Amino acid sequence: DQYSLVASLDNVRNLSTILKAIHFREHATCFATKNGIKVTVENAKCVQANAFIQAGIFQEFKVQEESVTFRINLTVLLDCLSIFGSSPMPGTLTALRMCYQGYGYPLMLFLEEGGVVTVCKINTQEPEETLDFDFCSTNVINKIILQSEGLREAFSELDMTSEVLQITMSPDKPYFRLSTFGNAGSSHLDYPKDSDLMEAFHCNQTQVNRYKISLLKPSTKALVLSCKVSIRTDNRGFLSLQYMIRNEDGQICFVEYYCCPDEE
Amino acid sequence: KCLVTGGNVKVLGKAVHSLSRIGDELYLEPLEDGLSLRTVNSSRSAYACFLFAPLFFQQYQAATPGQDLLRCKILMKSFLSVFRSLAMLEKTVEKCCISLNGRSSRLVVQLHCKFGVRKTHNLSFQDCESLQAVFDPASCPHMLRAPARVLGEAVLPFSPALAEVTLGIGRGRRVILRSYHEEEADSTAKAMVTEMCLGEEDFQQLQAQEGVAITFCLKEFRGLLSFAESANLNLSIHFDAPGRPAIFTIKDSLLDGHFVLATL
Amino acid sequence: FRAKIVDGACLNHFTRISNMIAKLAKTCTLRISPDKLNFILCDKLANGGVSMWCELEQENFFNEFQMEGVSAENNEIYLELTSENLSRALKTAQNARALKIKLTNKHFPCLTVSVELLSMSSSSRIVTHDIPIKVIPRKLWKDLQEPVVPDPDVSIYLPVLKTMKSVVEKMKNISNHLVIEANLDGELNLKIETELVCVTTHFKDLGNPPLASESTHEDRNVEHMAEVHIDIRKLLQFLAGQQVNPTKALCNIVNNKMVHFDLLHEDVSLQYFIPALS
C-alpha cells in the first residue's frame, strides 16, 4: 500500500527464532534498511546484541524510504508471532507485517492444522528512537569457529560469576580456554583441534582477556543452539565478538554479540 | 587420586545425587577399602555414607603415609552441580578423574570428553575435618529385606513429594503397614491420612514384632530409595521407640551403601 | 451412609474426571444421589465462585454402589472436599484391580477411597487407603447451592479447545481483560485491547445449534445480531483441564453478561459458567 515497510512470510518461524535468540532486554531497536531487518538489543552500555535477517528470507519484502527504524516491546512482539504454537507439525505458521509514518505496527498471522485456519491480528505501537550505540570493527587478532554441539554441552556448569577467554601459541596445536571464578570453584573448558569440521582456528599471537559474565550470559544460553565465531579485538579495545551461525530451512542467518568489559 | 570411567561415572553421579538430598555438605573420605561418601543432616539427626570399592575405579590411591588429614569437605551444591550437570551429557564415551592433591588447594575434579576438556577446581577452605568410623551394628532386633522396587510401590500411593511423616510399622499380624498422621481437626484444621500396606512374603526377609512403629522423615528415605536402580536390595534395620534410629543399608558388589535416619 | 466399587478402565475414566475437576476447582462439592447421580459443584464463600456443574452417571461404570442417609426429607446427599484428595487418591489406581469408596464415622468423618492393586510377586495382598477430609453441608444450603439453568441468547460450537488455549496463555501475558465475540456464521473472536498493543483472534468456520418452540414450522424470531462481552483469566481456568478435546464443545454467549460452556465428551457431560465484569 503506502507504508514505511511491508513484509509477508510463509514461515514465521524464521523471524520468530533468530528474533527469540537475542531477547533479554524488554525492548529493541529494529532499524530496517532496504536490505532486510536488523533488530538490536542494547544492555547496559557494554553489550550490544545485534540480529540481521536479510530480505531474501522474507518471501516478500518492500520498503519505501531507506529510513525505516523504531523501538518495540520485543517481549510482547515475540509473544505475538508465537500467539499459538509451542508445537507445530507439517502444518505451518505465516507472518505478514505493515508499518508506516510513526503510529502503528500491526502483524498478520494464520495457522492451518487438520480442520480449520486461524487469522490473528496484532498491532504493537512505537516509542522513542533511544540512544544509538555503535561498537567496533577495527582489527581482529585471533579468530575461532567452534561447534554447535560441544560448546552448548560445555556451558552445562552454571557459574553466574566471571569469564576469561584464552588462545594459545604453538607451531601446529593451539588451545582455547574458558574459566569461571566463583565461591570456591575455578573451572576450565578448552578445545583442541581434533575433529574440526567447520571448527577452524586462527590463533596467530598469544592472547588472554577478561569478561564480566553478567552480560554475555543471555548470549550463550539464548543464542548458541548453533555454532559461532569467537573473535577478540585489540584495536580500539580488547573485546568479544561472538556471532552465531543460525539458520532455518537453509538460509543466510546470523546474529551478533559484541561484548567488551574488564572486571567489576 | 580416584579415576571413574565409563558407565560407573553415572552410578556415582546418581550415588552423589542421593546424598545431595540428605545434606548441604559432603565428606569425601578416601581410605584403602574405597572412597567413602559421608554426610550428615543439617541438625545431626541423620547421617549418610556411600562407600565404593577400589575395583569400580580405573585407579585409586589413599596410601597409608602420613597422619595428614586426607579428608576433603565441600558444599554439597558446589559438588553435586558439578556431578549432576556433567555426565548425563554422554557423547560417545567419556572418563572422569577426581584428583585430590596432597599440598595446597583441596579438590580437583576434571572430565575428558574427546576434544574439549572440563576441569573444576574445588577450593575447600575453612580448614576443618569431621571424623570417626561409625559402623553401628545390628543394634536393632527388626530386620526387613526387600527388592528396592517393592519399597517404591509402597511410597507411590501417598507421594505428594511432600510427606515428612511416614510411619513404617510391622503391625497387624505379619503385614507391614505404612500409615502417617496428624490429629488437629477443627473448623478449618486439617490432615489427610494415607496408608500403604504390604504382603507378608512380598519381602525377602521380615523379622516379626507385632505392633511397633517408627516415624522417619520420608524425604531422607526417598533419597536412598531413588537409588532403586539395577533392582538393588534394600535393607531396613530398626530398633524400637524413638532415639534409636533406623538403618537403611544397601549391599552390592563394590558399592556399599549405608543410611542412618533418626526415628522420631 | 454410602458405598461404591469401581472395576474397569471406567476406573481411569473416573480418574481423569477427578483431575478434570482438581484442575479447574480447588474445593468442589460432590453429591452422591440415588443410584445414578454423581456431580461436582464449585462454590464455598468466594461469591458465585464461577459455577461448574458436572454430572456423570454412576449407572454404567460400577458393579455395585449403594445409597441412603438418615437424610432429612429426601434421599439425595451432598458432601464437600478439597479437590486434590480425590485426584491424588485416584491417580494411584489407574493401575489395575479395584477401588472401594465410602464415608467414615468418627476419626473426623471422611471420604474413604479404598484402593486395591495387583501383587505379581507370588500371592501377596497390597492395599492403599486414602482418606479425603470432607464436610457434609447443611440441610438448607442444598436448595441455594444449585447450578443448573436453561438459557438461550446465542449458541455456537467451539474450535480446537487446545488451539484456542495455545492463544489465551499468550493473551494473559498482555492483558487480564478478555472480550468474547460469537456469530450466526460460525465466527468467533478472541479479543484483547490495551493501549500499548491490541491483540485479536478470528476463529472462523464453525457451527451453530438450532432450538424450537410449540408451533408448526421451524421456530419464532427476534431482532438480534452479533454478540460481544468481556471477561478474565477465568476462561483460562476451564480451558487448562480440557486435554481430551470434548466430543461436543459449546459456547453460548448470553446477552453480554454470561458465558456458558456445554462440554460433553463420551459419557461425562460438564458445564462451566463465566460471569462478565472485571
| Residue whose C-alpha is closest to residue B113's, from A162, A208, A149 | A149
Radius of gyration for the alpha carbons in chain B, expressed in angstroms and rounded? 20
Flag if B119 and A194 touch (Cβ within 8 Å). no
| Residue whose C-alpha is closest to residue A257's, from A225, A224, A234 | A224
Domain assignment of residue B134, given as a range: 1-264
The total of other beta-carbon atoms located within 10 Å of residue A120's CB is 21
Q: Does B157 touch chain C (CB under 8 A)?
A: yes
List the single best residue of C178, C187, C200, C201 to mutate versus A (max A Cβ within 10 A).
Answer: C201
CB-based contact C36:C59 (threshold 8 Å):
yes
Resolution of the solved structure (Å): 3.2
* Gap between the Cα atoms of C15 and C88, Å rounded: 9
| Residue whose C-alpha is closest to residue C85's, from C128, C139, C32, C33 | C128
Q: Around C114, how many Cα atoms within 13 Å sit in the side-chain half-sphere?
A: 11
The total of other beta-carbon atoms located within 10 Å of residue B264's CB is 14
CA distance between the termini of chain C: 43
Helix (H) or strand (E) holding A78: helix A74-78
Q: Which of residues 142-171 of C touch A (CB under 8 A)?
A: 159-160, 163, 166-167, 170-171
Task: Say which residue the cell 445409597 belongs to.
Answer: C67
Q: What technique solved it?
A: X-ray
Instruction: Give how far Cα B174 sits from Cα of A235, B22, B148, B207, Å.
Output: 82, 31, 19, 9
Q: Which domains does chain C have, with CATH numbers?
A: 1-278 (3.70.10.10)
Q: What is the DSSP string of C249-266?
A: -B--EETTTEEEEEEEET
Residue among C92, C115, C131 minimizing CB distance to B192: C131
Helix (H) or strand (E) holding C272: strand C268-273
Residues in chain A closer than 8 A to B82 (CB atoms) = 157, 185, 187
Helix (H) or strand (E) holding A244: strand A240-244
Flag if B85 and A186 touch (Cβ within 8 Å). no
Helix, coil or strand: residue C135? strand
Q: What is the DSSP string of A134-203?
A: ----S--S-EEE--HHHHHHHTTS---SEEEEEE---SS---EEEEEEETTEEEEEE--SSS-SS--EE-
| Residue whose C-alpha is closest to residue A90's, from A65, A121, A114 | A114
Domain tally for chain B?
1
Q: What is the DSSP string of C195-244?
A: SSEEEEEE--S--------SSSSS--------B--EE-THHHHHHTT--S
Cell readout for A246 is: 543460525
B42: domain CATH number?
A: 3.70.10.10
Task: Say which residue the cell 529510513 belongs to.
Answer: A67
* Gap between the Cα atoms of B116 and B112, Å rounded: 7
* Gap between the Cα atoms of C29 and A218, Å rounded: 47
The total of other beta-carbon atoms located within 10 Å of residue C26's CB is 14
Give the chains touching C; criterion: ≥3 Cβ pairs < 8 Å: A, B
Cross-strand pairs, B176? B198
Instruction: Give how far Cα B68 sits from Cα of B32, B103, C155, Å.
Output: 15, 10, 83
Alpha-carbon distance B176 to nearest alpha carbon in chain C (angstroms): 10
Across the B/C interface, how many CB contacts are shorter than 8 Å?
54
Q: Which domains does chain A have, with CATH numbers?
A: 1-264 (3.70.10.10)
* Gap between the Cα atoms of C163 and A24, Å rounded: 27
